[PDB]
């Protein structure tokens, strides 16, 4: 029973939003609702425009991805009123003009790249913004003092049905043949909650003469940042190593615990983080779902998480055999509402 307001600098405009976040499904997006209030003796322009736009901030310039045009004019040329929308109208009165939005499916989520030590001011990333302004015509310029700029974020949550556990196998032989170097690893589950440990079971046996050096364990986050051309990025968000060695003609089996967190990753430039309202800190932006066989021409940042295990041999000059296990890391389903700020404020 709480709404969000953002008053215009001149005090003649305010936009009411029931929630600041919208759930994105595989092919369905929750519509954006709310009302806008305009005081009398100010609607001489006879045109109220509320626009929802998504832009890619780089460097600076804004590359608009999707732009929505909704007019809240008193004429208002069906759009049935939602229960939340209807409640706002009754409280404010007959001077409130409701507006609605229909975000198309298969769109990038609100993800912002983490700035490096050399701060550049504005945070680079995909941001969704809702703005309302009054003008005689659309082509007329809109002043910041005579408009509001409300920021919203589109987020996704882990599905209620977990998928199959990850599993992959590989075998590499070099110039010696026979006695394959068996290597396989698996994860407890495909979907991992934020902050939950990542446990991987590895089973390595080496019947070859060459020994096995220390095993490298790392978790890599992939950011498919494309705004002009496709360019995949790799970041080792989690990294831990053990000095365990595999003797020839022996079997090795151990479990390694991993935890992705940004406490020690604050100095890693290029990391992808969730939507930031003004300056708050998010937590390792979750993976972006896709509608199975969907086109990969999405102009935005796509986040995917994978687990890579690396084993280096002594070659009697060193060669490595690695098999990568993808996994999913998303937030659970909120009950009441997501707090879009640090709950303990200092």
């Amino acid at each position: 029973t709480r709404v969000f307001k953002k008053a215009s600098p001149n005090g003649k405009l305010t936009v009411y939003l029931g929630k600041r976040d919208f759930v994105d499904h595989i092919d369905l997006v929750e519509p954006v609702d709310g009302v806008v209030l305009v005081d009398p003796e100010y609607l001489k322009e006879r045109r109220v425009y509320v626009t929802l736009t998504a832009a890619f901030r780089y460097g600076t310039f804004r590359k608009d991805l999707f732009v929505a045009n909704v007019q809240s004019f008193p004429p208002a040329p069906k759009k049935p009123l939602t229960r939340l929308q209807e409640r706002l109208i009754k409280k404010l009165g007959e001077h409130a003009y409701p507006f609605t939005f229909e975000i198309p499916p298969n769109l990038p989520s609100s993800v912002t790249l983490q700035p490096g030590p050399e701060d550049t001011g504005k945070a680079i990333g995909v941001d969704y913004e809702v703005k309302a302004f009054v003008a005689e015509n659309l082509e007329e310029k809109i002043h910041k003092r005579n408009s509001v700029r409300l920021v919203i974020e589109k987020v996704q949550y882990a599905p209620e049905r977990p998928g199959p556990q990850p599993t992959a196998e590989t075998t590499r032989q070099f110039l010696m043949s026979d006695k394959p170097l068996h290597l396989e690893a698996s994860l407890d589950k495909e979907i991992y909650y934020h902050g939950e440990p990542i446990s991987v079971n590895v089973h390595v046996t080496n019947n070859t003469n060459k020994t096995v050096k220390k095993i490298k364990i790392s978790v890599r986050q992939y950011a498919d940042i494309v705004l002009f051309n496709t360019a995949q990025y790799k970041v080792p968000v989690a990294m831990e190593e053990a000095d365990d060695t595999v003797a020839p003609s022996s079997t090795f089996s151990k479990v390694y615990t991993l935890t992705p967190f940004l406490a020690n990753n604050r100095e890693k430039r290029g990391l992808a983080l969730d939507g930031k309202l003004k300056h708050e800190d998010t937590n390792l932006a979750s993976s972006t779902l896709l509608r199975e066989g969907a086109n990969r021409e999405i102009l935005g940042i796509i986040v995917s998480y994978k687990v890579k295990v690396k084993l280096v041999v002594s070659r009697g000059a060193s060669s490595d055999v690695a098999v990568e296990l993808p996994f999913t890391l998303m937030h659970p389903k909120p009950k009441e509402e997501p707090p879009h700020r640090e709950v303990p404020e200092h």
Partner: antibody
Framework: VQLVESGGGLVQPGGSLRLSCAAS????????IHWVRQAPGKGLEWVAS????????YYADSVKGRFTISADTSKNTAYLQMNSLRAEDTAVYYC?????????????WGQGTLVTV | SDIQMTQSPSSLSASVGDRVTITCRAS??????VAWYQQKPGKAPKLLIY???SLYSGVPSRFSGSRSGTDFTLTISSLQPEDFATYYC?????????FGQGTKVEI
């Protein structure tokens, strides 16, 4: 889901006492650990908090800098190293637990250790 | 600036089944970061309601919290015989994390 601690021993002014709080059923990076001090017969009071995921440490105004709070991942335990205690410190300390993400108050609380100076 | 929260009812006496209202006035403005905790004599506190409108899992449905402006209040429909305790307010919107003065309830 269960938090156990001992925190026993007589305390003298200008001394130290280390509190060990074992956490089971949950980790530290997804659960911020809070310490609540309650004077015998008075109301509750918050002294310290640790957020290992974000690496943020918070303290009360009256106990700022005096205490030392740290957490470990290998055994999932929360430590509260208090030094140079004053006379107005006789109370019961509770190892409260909350959620690192989607904070919804302190749901799980420790048994409570009596400290007398 | 620090935030100080006061609980108007310090102690009250009631029978089983009456409608008891406990109010809690706040100095500053808190959107929804209000929590109420139950405490038996010599027992660890237990969370009752979070966000001042939601209900915690396992808590009996008789408990209910309402917010009207700044004076957050907790209401109990029926006072069960074992429901006697001391209720403490809490805020988690700022750094101080200030608790209430307590409201002792006895049969």
């Amino acid at each position: 889901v269960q938090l156990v601690e001992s925190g026993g021993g007589l305390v003298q002014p200008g001394g130290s006492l280390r509190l060990s709080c074992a956490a089971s059923g949950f980790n530290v990076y997804s659960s911020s650990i809070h310490w609540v001090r309650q004077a015998p017969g008075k109301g509750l009071e918050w002294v310290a908090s640790i957020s290992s995921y974000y690496g943020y440490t918070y303290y009360a105004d009256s106990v700022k800098g005096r205490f030392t709070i740290s957490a470990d991942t290998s055994k999932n335990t929360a430590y509260l190293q208090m030094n140079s205690l004053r006379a107005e410190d006789t109370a019961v300390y509770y190892c409260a637990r909350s959620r690192q993400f989607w904070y919804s108050g302190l749901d799980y609380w420790g048994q409570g250790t009596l400290v007398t100076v | 600036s620090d935030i100080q929260m006061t609980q108007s009812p310090s102690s009250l006496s009631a029978s089983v089944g009456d409608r008891v209202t406990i109010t809690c006035r706040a100095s500053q403005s808190v959107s929804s970061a209000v929590a109420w905790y139950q405490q038996k004599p010599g027992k660890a506190p237990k969370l009752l309601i979070y966000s001042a409108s939601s209900l915690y899992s396992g808590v009996p449905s008789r408990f209910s919290g309402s917010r009207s402006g700044t004076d957050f209040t907790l209401t109990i429909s029926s006072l069960q015989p074992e429901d006697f305790a001391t209720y403490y307010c809490q805020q988690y919107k700022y750094v101080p994390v200030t608790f209430g003065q307590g409201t002792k309830v006895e049969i």
